[PDB]
Amino acid sequence: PIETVPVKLKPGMDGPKVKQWPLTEEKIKALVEICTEMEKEGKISKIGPENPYNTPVFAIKKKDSTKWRKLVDFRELNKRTQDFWEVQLGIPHPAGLKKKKSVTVLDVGDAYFSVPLDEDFRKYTAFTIPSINNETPGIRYQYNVLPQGWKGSPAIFQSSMTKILEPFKKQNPDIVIYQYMDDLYVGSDLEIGQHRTKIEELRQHLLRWGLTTPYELHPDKWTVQPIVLPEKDWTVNDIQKLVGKLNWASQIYPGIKQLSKLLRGTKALTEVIPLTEEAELELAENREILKEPVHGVYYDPSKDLIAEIQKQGQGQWTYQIYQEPFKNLKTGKYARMAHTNDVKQLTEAVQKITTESIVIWGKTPKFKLPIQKETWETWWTEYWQATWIPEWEFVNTPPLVKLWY
Amino acid sequence: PISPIETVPVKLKPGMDGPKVKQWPTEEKIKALVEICTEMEKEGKISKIGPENPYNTPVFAIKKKWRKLVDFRELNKRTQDFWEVQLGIPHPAGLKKKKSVTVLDVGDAYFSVPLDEDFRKYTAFTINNETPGIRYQYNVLPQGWKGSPAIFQSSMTKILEPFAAQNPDIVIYQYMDDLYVGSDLEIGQHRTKIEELRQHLLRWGLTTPDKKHQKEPPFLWMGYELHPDKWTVQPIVLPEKDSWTVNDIQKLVGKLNWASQIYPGIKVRQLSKLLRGTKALTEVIPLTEEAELELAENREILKEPVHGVYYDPSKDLIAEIQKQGQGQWTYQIYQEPFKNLKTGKYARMRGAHTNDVKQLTEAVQKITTESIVIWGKTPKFKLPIQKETWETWWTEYWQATWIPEWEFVNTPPLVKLWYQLEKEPIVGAETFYVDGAANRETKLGKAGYVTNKGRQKVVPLTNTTNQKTELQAIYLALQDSGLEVNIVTDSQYALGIIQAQPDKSESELVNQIIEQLIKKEKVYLAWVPAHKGIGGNEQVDKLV
Ligand SMILES: N#Cc1cc2c(Oc3ccccc3OCCC(=O)N3CCOCC3)cccn2c1
Ligand SMILES: [Mg+2]
């Protein structure tokens, strides 16, 4: 049909040679059903041994269904092509989407399967269905059509996307529309039910132009969340953790400092101590200084976004998005409502956090995950319900910060 | 025995040309060469070429009858990369039993596959008696060349695609130049299907064992012994030496690892600790007492041979983990109470301080991975740890982790929590303030305390570091304390070590602090900013 847009690699860069993760037998059989159909639809073709590239493949479940989906970790092929395909074809980020009182997210990646992928570039999309126990070297495919997850796939289809949206966009001058990867983020100020109709409008519009589509947000509740000083009717130990947190906080927000005095001399720990005027005065002065955020904190579009999470117990987790230590762009908490495996909670946490990042800044962060590397590389594919995958790595050493947040 | 198979196209690495490494005079070899050249030309495997300014690569000749050799090193450096042939191996513990299993080997496996046409020029080798330079050029996959293992495996795979759909009841494994075929149909039907396939292969070009299928069990395969119903490692000879070298201690700990898969109970901890002097390869390393004992316990295990069973998908998969000590654990995976599928060990400490539950969590992990690679599933875990033990651990662990469904097994030593700190300070129990310091220069230090009840101490410390003192400072406050102590430190470091609650550590001091902590009955460590005049700390910081 269409002409294969000429795809190139950032010069002097070779394609991905990521090793395939071993898979359970349930998951392999699903990738073998799925690819057998995708090969019948001509979407992907078998490939010879003269193709040395590989990127990994996982098997997840779509929203909640008995349907097996397929997921591809184009994170390496992205860093190698798209960093050039996001300038030669870049889709700009609307910086107001975070303002709108509601946002819904739509899965449009069925679009890409219409477009053929450049002939000379297909070799870089190779993947491998692994065998059990190295019985066979895997089954080897490369893509023939725009593959979802690649970041040049929405970039190529960008033109056709704005066409299909131009009627709806002009009839609704008040609705924000952002396409990140295979997702449309549609933001508006309607009350919910009308926001939902104007959604089903856009749904039905897109559906009747050939684009089939299968998560309600509210970014005006999001705020850099401040520091809570406890409310106690106070021992020596309480005034210690009070001096301790307050000292760490003073490293970022200038202001708030004498409290110690109310503990001068070698008191016992569980010695219930009273409250001094100058101390309460301090405490009050500190509490206000906290409520008030700081300045200097500006997103740097050249700098990567770094997300840290801590497990806080009883299902609570907390996170800080930043690019410079102590200079914290976004800060939030998280807690699901049962069958809440610690790892499910992290998966949901990470997915929530990257959406907030996609919405605000239109780039995903890199995660410092509080989890063993191999444990994550095993049960991450279980609760993963997203088309994309952030970068990540694994931290081993949070000293006192669990209390401090 | 050339083939009509489709060739796989091959390119040189972009912006490279083909090799030109001139040879140099071996009258008896030079002759042998001519003999193989024409006898291989007759089979079409190579062809003479008229020097049209083509390339070149060396070639040699060595008696084992003679044999020919080519140095392709300069060509492999210039040809493109291929897909990785087989980075791993099938583990026998994961094979499915078959009634009969036939082992075939294809001779000339590389010489029976055609090499691409446009890529043929770059293989030009030449065989000073003004030698006429009888220029040749390969036509099949040359032996040694970068692309042969990958391409041959692919050709072999396609050559098999008709036969495996015609006879879907038999199972073939590919491994380099071998085929392992195994059926559950009658042994007369077997000899027949084998004979069909051999002749099918030969219609493509692939010669196969004549004397029946030849290989009769037990099979000596990749350092295993495969018996028709048992698998076991090939036999192991641990040397007996007066002196031990790095080469010798690595070869030893290779052999010991190779055996850990089926001989339960192996340990290699204190042996590989020796390898931290990895500085050289022939440097003599004196054994230690724990090492020479360990190698002695390993000898006791190997003296009687034990074996492994195969996989039966219809029977569940089970895993048991038992504690050995000094951060060492063994596991067994079985379907049946006495028949092991395989065994193995976990000893990694992941740092210098670990506890028993964590090391057991890490172990389970290593097994889940290994189970998934081998059998494609995860096992049911039988674990020497109460539920009350683990629940309280991971609910308070700062890291996230995933604990599979497991059944408790009482067979000591059960894993336990030898102590818990309090989460809140102890009423009316003595609260030691502690601190310590050591002039890095003087490398000298002191550890002291100052309590609410008015007690104060300072101990002199020689050959220490500012870190090592602020742990003695905690040590002291423990050994000078009641069974309920509130200790309080300025040291972010020593707070960190303790709060992880290690039950095992490779520090002498930290093992002593552990022992005291076990003896105590309510400890509670709290932390306050260093040099922040919080009151009391200024005292422990005046002294010390
Ligand atoms: N030499 C050698 C050799 C043999 C095998 C091999 O056998 C099989 C081939 C096809 C299907 C099932 C096969 O095993 C099934 C298990 C089985 O009952 N066994 C009995 C003795 O023989 C080895 C194993 C598999 C892999 C590598 N192999 C390497
Ligand atoms: Mg000090």
The Cα B56–Cα B265 span in angstroms is 55
Q: Which CATH architecture has domain A217-299?
A: 2-Layer Sandwich (3.30)
Residue of B nearest to A133 (CA): B374
Are B341 and B262 contacting, i.e. CB atoms less than 8 angstroms apart? no
Length of chain A: 405
Which residues have a beta carbon within 5 Å of ligand 2, which is an ion? B 435, 490, 530, 541
What three-state secondary structure class fits A128? strand
Quickly list H helices, B342-386: 356-375
Are B193 and B167 contacting, i.e. CB atoms less than 8 angstroms apart? yes
Q: Which atom of ligand 1 approaches the CA of B97 most closely?
A: 18
What three-state secondary structure class fits B353? strand
Give how far A157 is from chain B: nearest CA, Å.
Answer: 31
Q: Could you tell me which of A190, A206, A204, A191 has the C-alpha nearest to residue A110?
A: A206
The Cα B477–Cα B485 span in angstroms is 8
Are A376 and A349 contacting, i.e. CB atoms less than 8 angstroms apart? no
Quickly list H helices, B414-487: 466-479
Are B398 and A402 contacting, i.e. CB atoms less than 8 angstroms apart? yes
Looking at residue A329, its amino acid is L
Residue in the structure block whose two tokens are 């109460």: B386
> Is B248 marked within a binding site?
no
Domain ranges, ordered by start, for chain B: 27-204, 218-308, 309-417, 430-542
The Cα B204–Cα B192 span in angstroms is 19
The Cα A140–Cα A129 span in angstroms is 7
Residue in the structure block whose two tokens are 């091959």: B10
Contact yes or no for A269 and B488 at CB 8 A: yes
Structure tokens at B507: 């520090």
B484-489 and B504-505 beta bridge pairing: unpaired
Domain range A6-95+121-161, its CATH number among 3.30.1330.60, 3.10.10.10, 3.20.20.210, 3.20.20.10: 3.10.10.10
Length of chain B: 544
Q: How far is CA A267 from CA A239, B128, B427, B449, B535, in A?
A: 11, 98, 13, 13, 8
**CB-closest option in B154, B399, B425 to A270:** B425
| Residues of chain B contacting residue A268, judged by C-beta atoms under 8 Å apart | 428, 430-431, 452, 486
- Contact with chain B for residue A371, Cβ under 8 A: yes
Contact yes or no for A263 and B536 at CB 8 A: yes
- Contact with chain A for residue B143, Cβ under 8 A: no
Instruction: Please list the residues that pair with A327 across neighbouring strands.
Output: A324
List the 403-442 stretch of B: residues with Cβ below 8 A of A.
Answer: 424-428, 430-431, 433
Written as one string, the DSSP assignment of A227-244 is PPPP-----HHHHHHHHH
Residues of chain A within CATH 3.30.70.270 domain(s) are 96-120+162-216, 217-299, 300-405
Are B520 and B418 contacting, i.e. CB atoms less than 8 angstroms apart? no
Q: Could you tell me which of A48, A50, A67, A47 has the C-alpha nearest to residue A59?
A: A67
- Contact with chain A for residue B314, Cβ under 8 A: no
Contact yes or no for A243 and B431 at CB 8 A: no
Q: How far is CA B387 from CA A256, B325, B378, B528, in A?
A: 46, 22, 20, 35
Verify cis geometry, omega within 30 degrees of 0, for the bond prior to B168: no
- Is there an atom of ligand 1 within 6 Å of B228 CB? yes
Q: How far is CA B519 from CA A175, B224, B419, B423, B484, in A?
A: 67, 50, 9, 18, 10
A366-369 and A306-313 beta bridge pairing: parallel
Q: How far is the CA of B101 from the centre of ligand 1 (A)?
A: 6
Q: How far is CA B137 from CA A30, B29, B79, in A?
A: 46, 19, 16
CATH class of B218-308: alpha beta
DSSP for residue B459: E
Are B496 and B457 contacting, i.e. CB atoms less than 8 angstroms apart? no
Give how far A150 is from chain B: nearest CA, Å.
Answer: 22
List the 260-279 stretch of A: residues with Cβ below 8 A of B.
Answer: 260-261, 263-271
Q: Which CATH architecture has domain B430-542?
A: 2-Layer Sandwich (3.30)
If one counts every other C-beta atom within 10 angstroms of the C-beta of residue B156, the result is 22
The Cα B542–Cα B544 span in angstroms is 6
**CB-closest option in A28, A265, A398 to B535:** A265
List the 198-227 stretch of B: residues with Cβ below 8 A of A.
Answer: none
Written as one string, the DSSP assignment of A243-269 is HHHHHHHTTTSS----GGGGGTTT--T
Written as one string, the DSSP assignment of B244-255 is -BHHHHHHHHHH
Same fold? B218-308, B430-542: no
Q: Could you tell me which of B280, B366, B300, B302 has the C-alpha nearest to residue B328?
A: B366
Resolution at which this structure was determined, Å: 3.0
Instruction: Please list the residues that pair with B433 across neighbouring strands.
Output: B450, B488
- Is there an atom of ligand 1 within 6 Å of B179 CB? no
List the 282-341 stretch of A: residues with Cβ below 8 A of B.
Answer: 310-311, 313, 341
Q: C-alpha A152: how far from its chain's center?
A: 19
Structure tokens at A346: 């992290």
Written as one string, the DSSP assignment of B279-306 is T-SS-B----HHHHHHHHHHHHHHHS--
Domain range A96-120+162-216, its CATH number among 3.40.50.11270, 3.30.70.270, 3.40.1410.10, 3.30.1360.200: 3.30.70.270
Contact yes or no for A49 and B82 at CB 8 A: yes
Contact yes or no for B402 and A341 at CB 8 A: yes
> Is B490 marked within a binding site?
yes
Superfamily of domain A300-405: Reverse transcriptase/Diguanylate cyclase domain (3.30.70.270)
- Contact with chain A for residue B174, Cβ under 8 A: yes
**CB-closest option in A265, A346, A399 to B492:** A399
Instruction: Just give the CATH number of B309-417.
Output: 3.30.70.270
Enclosing H/E stretch for A203: helix A192-208
Q: How far is the CA of B89 from the centre of ligand 1 (A)?
A: 13
Q: With breaks defined as C to next N over 2.5 Å, after which residues does chain A break? A: 214, 233, 257, 337
The Cα A198–Cα A200 span in angstroms is 6
Mutation for testing the B interface, residue in A134, A241, A367, A381 having most B CBs under 10 Å: A134
The Cα B15–Cα B13 span in angstroms is 6
Contact yes or no for B535 and A247 at CB 8 A: no
Q: Which fold has domain B27-204?
A: HIV Type 1 Reverse Transcriptase; Chain A, domain 1 (3.10.10)
